[PDB]
From a paper:
When E268A-NAD+ crystals are soaked with 2-HMS for 40 min or less, their single-crystal electronic absorption spectra show an absorbance maximum at 422 nm, as was observed in the solution-state titration and the stopped-flow assays. The structure of E268A-NAD+ soaked with 2-HMS for 30 min before flash cooling was solved and refined to 2.15 Å resolution. The angle between the plane of the carbon backbone of the substrate and the formerly aldehydic oxygen is 55±9°, compared with the angle of the wild-type thioacyl intermediate at 26±4°. More importantly, the C6 of 2-HMS and the C4N of NAD+ are very close (2.4–2.8 Å), making it unlikely that the hydride has been transferred from the substrate. However, in this work, the E268A mutant is shown to accumulate the preceding thiohemiacetal intermediate both in crystal and in solution.
One enzyme in particular, 2-aminomuconate-6-semialdehyde dehydrogenase (AMSDH), is responsible for oxidizing the unstable metabolic intermediate 2-aminomuconate-6-semialdehyde (2-AMS) to 2-aminomuconate (2-AM). On the basis of sequence alignment, AMSDH is a member of the hydroxymuconic-semialdehyde dehydrogenase (HMSDH) family under the aldehyde dehydrogenase (ALDH) superfamily.
Author numbering:
A (entry chain C), B (entry chain D), C (entry chain A), D (entry chain B): 18 to 500
The structure:
Amino acid sequence: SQLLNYIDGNFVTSASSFANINPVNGKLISDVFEADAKQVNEAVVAAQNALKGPWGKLSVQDRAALIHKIADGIQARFEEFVAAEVADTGRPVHQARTLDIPRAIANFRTFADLAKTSHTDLFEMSTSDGSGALNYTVRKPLGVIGVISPWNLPLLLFTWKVAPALACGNTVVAKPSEESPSSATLLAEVMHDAGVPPGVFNLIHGFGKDSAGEFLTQHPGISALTFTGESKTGSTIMKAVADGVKEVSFALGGKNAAVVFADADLDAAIEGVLRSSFTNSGQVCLCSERVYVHRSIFDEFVSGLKVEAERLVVGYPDQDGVNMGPLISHGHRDKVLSYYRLAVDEGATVVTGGGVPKFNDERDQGAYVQPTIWTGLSDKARCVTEEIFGPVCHISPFDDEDEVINRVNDSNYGLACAIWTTNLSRAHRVSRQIHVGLVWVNTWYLRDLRTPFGGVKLSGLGREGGRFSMDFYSDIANICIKI
Amino acid sequence: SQLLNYIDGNFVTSASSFANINPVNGKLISDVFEADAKQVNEAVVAAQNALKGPWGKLSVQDRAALIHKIADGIQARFEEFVAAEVADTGRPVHQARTLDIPRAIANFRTFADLAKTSHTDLFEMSTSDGSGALNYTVRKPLGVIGVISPWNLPLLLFTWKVAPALACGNTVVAKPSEESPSSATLLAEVMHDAGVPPGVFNLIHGFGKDSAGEFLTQHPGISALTFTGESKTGSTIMKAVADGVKEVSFALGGKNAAVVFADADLDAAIEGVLRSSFTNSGQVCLCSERVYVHRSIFDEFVSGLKVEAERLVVGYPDQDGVNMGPLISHGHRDKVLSYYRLAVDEGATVVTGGGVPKFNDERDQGAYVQPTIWTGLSDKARCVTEEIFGPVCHISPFDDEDEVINRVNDSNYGLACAIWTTNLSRAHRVSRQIHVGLVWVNTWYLRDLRTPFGGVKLSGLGREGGRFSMDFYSDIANICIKI
Amino acid sequence: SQLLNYIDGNFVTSASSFANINPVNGKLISDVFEADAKQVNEAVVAAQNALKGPWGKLSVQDRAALIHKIADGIQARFEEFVAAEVADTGRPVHQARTLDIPRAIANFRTFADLAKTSHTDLFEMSTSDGSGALNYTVRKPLGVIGVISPWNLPLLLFTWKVAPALACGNTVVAKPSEESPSSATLLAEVMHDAGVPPGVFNLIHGFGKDSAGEFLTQHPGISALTFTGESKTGSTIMKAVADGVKEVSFALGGKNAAVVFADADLDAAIEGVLRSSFTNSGQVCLCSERVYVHRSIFDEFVSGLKVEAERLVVGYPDQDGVNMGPLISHGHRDKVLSYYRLAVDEGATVVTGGGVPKFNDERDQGAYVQPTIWTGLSDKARCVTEEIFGPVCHISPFDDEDEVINRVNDSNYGLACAIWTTNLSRAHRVSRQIHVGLVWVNTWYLRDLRTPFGGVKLSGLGREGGRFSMDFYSDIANICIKI
Amino acid sequence: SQLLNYIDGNFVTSASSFANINPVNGKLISDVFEADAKQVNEAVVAAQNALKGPWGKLSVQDRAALIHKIADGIQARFEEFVAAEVADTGRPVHQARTLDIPRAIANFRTFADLAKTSHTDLFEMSTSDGSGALNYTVRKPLGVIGVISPWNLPLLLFTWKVAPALACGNTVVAKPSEESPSSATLLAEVMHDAGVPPGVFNLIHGFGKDSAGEFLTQHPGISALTFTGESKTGSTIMKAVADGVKEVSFALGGKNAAVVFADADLDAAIEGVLRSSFTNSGQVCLCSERVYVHRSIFDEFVSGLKVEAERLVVGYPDQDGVNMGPLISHGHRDKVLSYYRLAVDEGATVVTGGGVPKFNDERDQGAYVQPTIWTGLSDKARCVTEEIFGPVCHISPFDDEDEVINRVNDSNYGLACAIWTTNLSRAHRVSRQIHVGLVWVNTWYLRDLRTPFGGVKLSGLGREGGRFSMDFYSDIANICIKI
Ligand SMILES: NC(=O)c1ccc[n+]([C@@H]2O[C@H](COP(=O)([O-])OP(=O)(O)OC[C@H]3O[C@@H](n4cnc5c(N)ncnc54)[C@H](O)[C@@H]3O)[C@@H](O)[C@H]2O)c1
Ligand SMILES: NC(=O)c1ccc[n+]([C@@H]2O[C@H](COP(=O)([O-])OP(=O)(O)OC[C@H]3O[C@@H](n4cnc5c(N)ncnc54)[C@H](O)[C@@H]3O)[C@@H](O)[C@H]2O)c1
Ligand SMILES: *[C@@H](O)/C=C/C=C(\O)C(=O)O
Ligand SMILES: *[C@@H](O)/C=C/C=C(\O)C(=O)O
Ligand code: NA
Ligand code: NA
Ligand code: NA
Ligand code: NA
């Protein structure tokens, strides 16, 4: 398998390629051509030009219909997309079929639809000569949108950014994670076979620092950079676009909490926290790495969760009943294992997991870890405050509502929080006090694509979703007519 | 006159003071205590703590009423505010009476009202279990807003930021320009007398680099930095807050064009470009420093505008018939004159002005320049491309509508544009193709405070005004209830 | 006390007058001049001409200022409006001071503010020739608004309609209930003193059929009729305006249910039903005259409610601890007691009340009844299905959630419902299935003036409140510009 | 046996049938089964029950997808719908192919998409106890929507009502005009084949008074009546639903003006008024039957219009170059001719037309009239004030802007107006002064489905389109949660 860049409607190679590795078994899936600076520049110049081409003559209806045809194109090759994402990431085949690929199709459909329904504002005003004036606003393409996406939900997160960008009439230069370039390379083919005009969508492969990522980010021809990934990388990008005062949208790290109150459905909460901690092998920005449980139910909670955690089938993506795949890479497994060790040193009681499973097959050449649960760390322990991004959670008891609110908020992160309670007052009283972008009550990672999505503090900047995307990916222009 | 900081409800001095100079005659107005890094810290910490005090517990409608009292308090001392603004900056008294102070009062009233009327969103969704879920959004105080403002329209721009910050329930640490500290200090007196809780509004005086401005900007306790000023300054601030991923809102430099089509009402356009070029002595980010006029009317437009510019009265703030005051400072005048000779060096014809008026009285120790019109520079000339921020405009002919659109857009700035034409289609056709945040047709600087205001490219990022402000100065939070 | 009409900036009498009677003691309070058909004509014509005068030239901001001036005027005569409302209706002074008069003031201010903040819409479209077109909407005054209000909440409901009418720039001909004429007449005094131009606000007194009310609805010069009152009267007015196709907005009767689930806070629910059945002596359209309580707590609820209802103080408006004044009039009391008898005929257990209290003072000549609770009627009983509009509820057990939802919805009315439950899911699940315009959970008649307000089925048509009032009281006009 | 009713999922006949006549030649096209009171009852009960079936359980996304399938179903049978529409109406085949059928399809698609994008509101408030409350709104199906549609744009208008009715989750009982029942009959087959559940969409045929229309209108089981047609019929319908207080939405007659100012593009304006007077043979509610032209261009305008009008090809729907078909029926033709005669009695000059063309073939048996232009009537002539609904316009000169605005607004109708001018100020200054729901500038009948559509005065009640339809076809419910 080989992965090429897609630039101005042509698939091209580079002066250097790098390896894409199947994390299940450590085998090489493909060679990926790393776009160099010159190739990045040629991508940005083509996107700039495509704005003055036929793409720019498209009506909002026709533009939307072509976008639906992109979505149709994915559905047409659906099983191939499942396969690509699995290969790259080792995610359960089932998860890719029901979450990753359908969501990516919905991303285009939703923004196409929004592109047709969205309108702007009329403001009337009086003037000293008694004739008055009109102010109306319009949404225009921002211009060239730089897209840099991570490896955890590769197609889902890539299209979450590309779909609104294109729905708003922009052109795109997009750099998917080095770890998961396949689904995106397939998307490039779909764009091509859909008739998407050359230069409208450009795919560049490579890494971050000193590679395609950084180059995109320093290129003066882009109008915006929308980014999803590590919080320190966001800060880096922010400095990098700062001289050109580019528009920026960041969705970054979390150290998310789940809170289980004494009046929760205990069974539901054990299940809910199971999913929030070990979905995608804990490799979601939204996962609950910290969990607080009311003292009256703490032991029974931990017991129930240890049990459910131990039932999880960690194995082949297509293995019957498989709940967990491996981590994305060996690099990332090193990091996580380091935290596993650090938790021990920090005084943690390992309730379950804490190492790597043994398969006695090619999987031992992969990057699996076990779902871990910890107990017994203080609120200041590095393991409770820093993002690990593995299938792991620490559980602590609490006694008071105000106490636990304060403990959830005592963080430099503020992405999401899940709350469990059956009490109507509590649910609304507590939810509005959590200093994050996203609260779920009695569920987790339930997504309505119209809602504003984003974090506070280190967890991000800006919001995406619904009109928040329609606004971010557009110039808002105000036009004032004296009458 | 002594100008103290206002921190945690107390007026305080500092170890170091600096001079506030009247640009009309170079006289010392006041001494201003420069807040040090320790005092900046006190203000932020106080602002943080105010959030958990009585301020935090006010209903939206009680907050709004208090903000109307701030407005009332300014009205009550209207002429003192007029005097302070005039003293600092040399602006004609009439301008201070009609634009400057009324707008600061209106800023507070407009946003107090929006605080009461604004609401958020409800999203219903289906779930696999058929029970559905509810997503609702809420606006909360973002936290501590750092405000840093420029000297050209001091109280107007200061309150443009402080009013929505307070209306959204934030607490504020605000640093007005070192050239224009007086109206902000009077505002702190109004806040005090109005009973605004201590720590809610904090005034820190000083400079930018290695001073109060930079310290505010580096403090980890702020939640956002909103800034109006030079574009390179914006970049610096953006770099400075990057490690903290602070929300940012910037309104930056411009090199705005006016365009006069052959079907313009010629006299209205002459008068209009007069205003857009020389209002506030050209020290408005909105001012037209480039002007394009159709060939068939170029000569007559130029001659008309010359006569009108030479009729402008340049003088004392309360002189009879005065149109223009000085520039803000000797420092700024040096920069402006430097461009004036650059224009000669680049080959411009000086239609008028191009120097300093001679008064033969105390005003000669002030910072006056002449209103200045150039002709004959190419589009690449630095004087046509770089923001001067003085009372100057270069005028150039054009023949074709597309050509002029391209000439207007061929800029690293994109703040505003003014267009003159009596043609219905033209006004809408052309306006939408100008790459700026703000277009005016047959007028200029006519403001409805509900409109989004801001720039593209180097002229800013984000928008303010109406709901754009209400969204920027608020945490937007999505709460999702599984049913 | 003399109550005159106010037509075209003047107070005028009429050829016929009728008695305003204090329901506390049956005493004469005022003579009220009944406008005849000629006078209603005079009012409408003056209102038509007012739209062409100075009122029509006001900016939105100026119009809003003046309406705030109306609200200042009522505040400055606060206690006079209290006394006027109390004399007409017998309502407790505290209720007048806390709900009635303050809401009338807040109605004016809320819509004044909405007049300032409200804006309209901009829709861009493609055209076959490629040049495109734009559609913008504006709100204009509808024209002359005919207002007809009831006696149960005289000034609150009168101003609920008059405030948005005026705020949207219309002119008004308004006819308060013949039973409660006084506060509306003081309002005409405030309008006059505040310098509202003549013809903008016209007050006409009288009855329905063959009097001022009917003449209003029949007049071709009005543009809309907004009405609050009995459902059958809504129907008559709908027929009356049909030939003119006048805009209509109706808030009508109800037979509202309250539902107490097993998981309810029982003491709170008992207090809340006490309030929802007997506030204003049950003479609120939102009152709960049907109550359903889970069988498991039915006996305990009914006992608790009996105790609380029997502690209600029935007496003078300023009597210490007073909970209930009299009914509006002897005629209304006749209706209510005839229902008290009917309930017994239909087989009800009279839990408490069911007659008139004996005072041994002037109150015996008034129109008092006792607060009254019934048990043991079928869902088909007339007393359980017909609106009584007095201080009464019937309580009935239920077993199942779907059952009680069907029972509540089983009605020709659908104004409001109140639900008691501490369970998060139940609150949202059940609320969305009640076929009414207004649900409260764990409270009753809590009003945010921005929300849509109205009923379904016989309880109304249209909604008012927030932008719904702003839309109803305005012509919405679409203007399409081919570019 | 040709055109059957469609009730609870079955095509059924009726006791009595009536003739459908082709207006090209007076021949029988089909027999139509007239639904009786019993069958109208069955349809309404079945629609009531369908709300409780699976249609009731569809998610908003599935409901939308299903509506897109109805649309696909029409597209699949495109030319069959074209032929049915042409057969009933005589409309040119090109008009059917480009306007009628595509618009019908776009109706279903636009509202399906709005169903998925539309959201509601969240309002936060403070309370006495310091805990606060939430108010949130939801859109629910109104219930059974009764649709009564006219014959002039049969499928377009029928689906303009049925699409948002179905998109908001309602069920429908719809009665197309006796004159044009074929396309609606095919639509029922498309619903059937798409698997729309039984009772969700019901088609009943017949007349107004004493037939299916009147019966639908009086049935206690509908929740709303949306109607398009003559004003007097709107009035009758308004009275009929009055006892039930059913929600109503009316788009009624007009007597629309076009205004041509001296600075218009004269050739565009002639073309423009030629389209607005004579499209669909003047059988559009939006047609200009009154035309006002500035005296300086009056004779030239009239001369130009005459030439263009006499170039119109009046004939067969498939006739090479055809512009206009017949009127809908003999009875309508008699009406129009009656006006043609009345116009002469009122002293008009017949610039062109005024009678029936002599074809010397089977068209002479159809219902054709000539396109007609009058001059010389007074503003009070019946022919200038009463809607004729034929291919005719009267043209009158004017001198002053305020004069022509008054004469335009001097009407009991107020549906639409067209203005021709190239002047920027005039366009916006004049458009806002015309008392109609819809204004076009330099065009006519250009429709964006998002925009509010409706009239003032006799021309209608309420607005449809965009969110206006989503609100009318829904219950709006406010739910308030005490916290
Ligand atoms: N876009 C707008 O709406 C708008 C409005 C007014 C002025 N401006 C721009 O402002 C400029 C002229 O005004 P100016 O001289 O006051 O701008 P400026 O950049 O010189 O300074 C503005 C403010 O920033 C502070 N500051 C300077 N350096 C700083 C630093 N390193 N860190 C933190 N704070 C710092 C200053 O003390 C001052 O308060 C022009 O470019 C003009 O277009 C823009
Ligand atoms: N405002 C708009 O959007 C619009 C659009 C198209 C046409 N129209 C109007 O349609 C009119 C032409 O309508 P028409 O000639 O179809 O006659 P019509 O308006 O009387 O009939 C229209 C529909 O109403 C039904 N109907 C008639 N009388 C009824 C009754 N008493 N009860 C219940 N239903 C009844 C008919 O059977 C038919 O289906 C013109 O006034 C024209 O302006 C308005
Ligand atoms: C973080 O890893 C999760 C992000 C999810 C979204 O961006 C999404 O569901 O759209
Ligand atoms: C009147 O004949 C025309 C009505 C048109 C519409 O209602 C529409 O285009 O939606
Ligand atoms: Na990998
Ligand atoms: Na100074
Ligand atoms: Na009375
Ligand atoms: Na026919």
